[PDB]
Each structure stands twice: as C-alpha cells, then as structure tokens.
C-alpha cells in the first residue's frame, strides 16, 4: 500500500545481517522465486520491470547483477 | 516451454557452487526481485504460487523457507 517502506528489503542493505545463516536463507528463497518466474506471464512482466529499473539510480552498486538479469545470464557463476 | 529444465536453477543445487562470489550475486539478485514482487498484481500471484508449491515434495529441505514466504515473514533474520 502507498507510502510503506519495505523493512525486509532495507535489512538486506546492511552488512551487519550478511551472515552465513541469512546467505543460506536468501539462496534458498531465491531458488523458490526462480521457479515462480518460470510461470507463464511472470517472466515477461519481470523483464518489463527490469527494462525500467535499470534506469533507476537508486540501484547503485547493482550494475553487474542487473545486466545479467536483463540479458538472461546465469544466476550464478559455475566457473 | 515444454521439456526444458532451468539449468540456472539446477546449478544452485550443487554445493560446489556455493562460493562467496555466488552468495553475493544471489543476495543482490534477490533484492532486485524483491522490488518486483512489490508491483501491483505480482504480490498476489506470488502468494497463489506459494500455496500450490508447498505441497510439492520436490522441495525437500526448503520447509522453513517456504513457510516464511507463505506467511510473510522477514526475508532475513535481523535478531533484535
């Protein structure tokens, strides 16, 4: 709803919480969302979102990750 | 489309790739998707997805994370 800040997101900006417990939790919740993004309709809406969001200068420090998502590059590096 | 597996997903199942480089990359791509999920429409579709997916026995070892997503719990644990 209008005017709310996403406290859960703001937590992820603070290196204090970048612990081994939370990195594992995020990795697994990411795998969960990845399967949602395969759903008909959602993939196309996600890409539309990415095309707008890459212009948003609030995402400073995320340039490589955005480029990768925007271009359909692997989620992780397999070496 | 039919019969393809998500090779990117399958990589994430192998502990060989659970490196500090990839954990950081995943954390940031997760933050990117989190803002997408705030978009009108998407939030409701995600929850509908979760309600089906929790019965999918293929997600063994993910029980706590699913429960948390299904019930709107914090993405990460902030102690305090």
Author numbering:
A (entry chain A): -10 to 68
B (entry chain B): -10 to 69
How did the manuscript describe this experimental structure?
Here we determined that the arbitrium system in Bacillus subtilis phage phi3T modulates the bacterial toxin–antitoxin system MazE–MazF to regulate the phage life cycle. AimX also inhibits the function of phi3T_93, a protein that promotes lysogeny by binding to MazE and releasing MazF. In all structures, phi3T_93 shows an identical all-helices fold composed of a longer N-terminal helix (α1), followed by two shorter helices (α2 and α3) connected by a long unstructured loop forming a V-like shape. The α1 helices of two phi3T_93 monomers interact, resulting in a W-shaped tight and globular dimer that displays two shallow grooves, one across each side of the dimer molecule.
We obtained the structure of phi3T_93 alone (wt and its N-terminal His-tagged version; His-phi3T_93) and in complex with AimX. Interestingly, in the His-phi3T_93 structure, the N-terminal His-tag folds as helices and are also accommodated in the dimer grooves replicating the AimX contacts, supporting the idea that the phi3T_93 grooves are specifically designed to accommodate a short helix. Size exclusion chromatography coupled to multi-angle light scattering (SEC–MALS) analysis confirmed the phi3T_93 dimeric organization in solution.
